[PDB]
Amino acid sequence: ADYQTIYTQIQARGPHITVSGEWGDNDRVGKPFYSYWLGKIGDAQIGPIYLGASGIAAFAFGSTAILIILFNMAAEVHFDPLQFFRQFFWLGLYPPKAQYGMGIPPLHDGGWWLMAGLFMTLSLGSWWIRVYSRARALGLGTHIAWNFAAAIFFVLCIGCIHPTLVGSWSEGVPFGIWPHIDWLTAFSIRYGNFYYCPWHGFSIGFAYGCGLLFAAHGATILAVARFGGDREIEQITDRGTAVERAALFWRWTIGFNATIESVHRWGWFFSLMVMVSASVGILLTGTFVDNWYLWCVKHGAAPDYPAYLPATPDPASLPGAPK
């Protein structure tokens, strides 16, 4: 077999290389150090890292958000250190439990949550600029930033756009391990089972699709590592036997194939669609669809099954039944 595809048999060490950016070259901090074990499966060098204004802005806003969250979580366990570590997962910062419509909620019932959300948002925007800027500084296209923007947009949709569209901050996503998880079921239940939301289905199709694609693409490149298939850039500008074989493996298998450059377009697309599809789904929920299952039933798409145990009438609709 090709042991190189599993790990690097013989590691190489050489001078620290640096590609100058259009700016901020003097903003790189840290001395590069090497990890022998890391070099078995990746590049051995760690750091240096680029600071910059947007980057620093990000940590500042992000740190503020986290502190607001941790303090409220600490309040939940009456500031007991041991109970805090114990109950961590169960702790959270929740949005308004009461219905205040779009009115700014009091600090004890949604206030802090909203504030943390604001700072998280600023943190994301700042980090977006960094992702976008570094590409420009290095003379690179901005494909990553645009993919990142789709993910940020999705977060904003479940974070505050959907809440705004229905007029209630109560719909927001809580901060916390189990709490943000519980929100998923609360939301799905309220909106009639997310399994029947076409956009939920699209998102999953693309999410599963990403798993399929990276597995196939990743495996494809390792399978042709002996021909330098990993050097994708020059394989794009000058097709080598590595990608000719890759393409043929696929053409012979499924009947068609991509190019070494286009397969990355497919990957980029599938990735983006997970977020775009999810966003569209959220934007339509509550706004124009109240119960996805019923919506599907309305359009005759929902499956139906025979009764196993006897069919059960709603006791509430029976005559004389209590409230």
Partner: protein
């Protein structure tokens, strides 16, 4: 009254559902599938007597050409016609077009089947600052083998037949990615050196095992024009040679595994 309702049986979500499928199919068929054809098209077929009329479909499936501005000068445009004039020592095993081809000489030397290499440029792959990227340590002075790993230099190379076929004299590193890609060995009973991709080397502490080819076959490994440089096409030639052994080193390798 209902939010999203537009008629007796028409609502917003329902319309967006159609739009979404339309967007997906348009992007997949009109865009991505055309990008998939920037290499290898138009397809080819053995001409009979009189047939030189470009089908409309061959124009429709292709995207508009794009041009890559190379970092060290020049440009590349794709798609573009790239017929392979190089004669191939292969013969048809049967009559139909789907029949496999069979080598007529030495597939490793003739470079056919899994021994085939691409028509890459005869240029040395470069580093960002303009130097040769893949070079031996005798040249890449500032590069070394990490402490802890085997130093193949001096170690013998054992082929699939168990016979020692040479002695490792150097390692070629990728100065752009800090990574070893080839090993250079002195071929036993010959006045030549040969490179072997690391992916074809089982690096032991006391030897370098190579199962792709037999000791006798290290003699015909493609030769480089220079001793301290290698071109993109040579890399393909060298790599393809060993890959060819996987199927052709011995008569039984090409036959049914089970």
């Amino acid at each position: 009254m209902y939010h999203g309702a537009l008629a007796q049986h028409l609502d917003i979500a329902q319309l967006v559902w159609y739009a979404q499928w339309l967007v997906i199919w348009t992007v997949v068929l009109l865009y991505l599938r055309r990008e998939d054809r920037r290499e290898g098209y138009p397809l080819v077929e053995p001409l009979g007597l009189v047939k030189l009329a470009p089908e409309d479909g061959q124009v429709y499936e292709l995207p508009y050409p794009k041009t890559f501005v190379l970092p060290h000068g020049g440009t590349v445009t794709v798609p573009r016609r790239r017929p392979e004039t190089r004669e191939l020592k292969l013969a048809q095993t049967d009559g139909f077009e789907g029949a496999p081809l069979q080598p007529t000489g030495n597939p490793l030397v003739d470079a056919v089947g899994p021994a085939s290499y691409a028509e890459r440029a005869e240029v040395v792959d470069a580093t960002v600052d303009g130097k040769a990227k893949i070079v031996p340590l005798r040249v890449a002075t500032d590069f070394s083998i990490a402490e802890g790993d085997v130093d193949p230099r001096g170690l013998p190379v054992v082929a699939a037949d168990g016979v020692e076929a040479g002695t490792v004299t150097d390692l070629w590193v990728d100065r752009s990615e800090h990574y070893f890609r080839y090993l250079e060995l002195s071929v036993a009973g010959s006045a030549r050196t040969a490179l072997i991709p690391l992916g074809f080397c089982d690096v032991k502490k006391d030897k370098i095992v190579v199962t792709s080819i037999l000791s006798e076959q290290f003699a015909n490994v493609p030769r480089l024009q220079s001793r301290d440089q290698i071109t993109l096409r040579e890399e393909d030639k060298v790599s393809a040679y060993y890959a060819g052994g996987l199927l052709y080193a011995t008569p039984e390798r090409a036959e049914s595994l089970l």
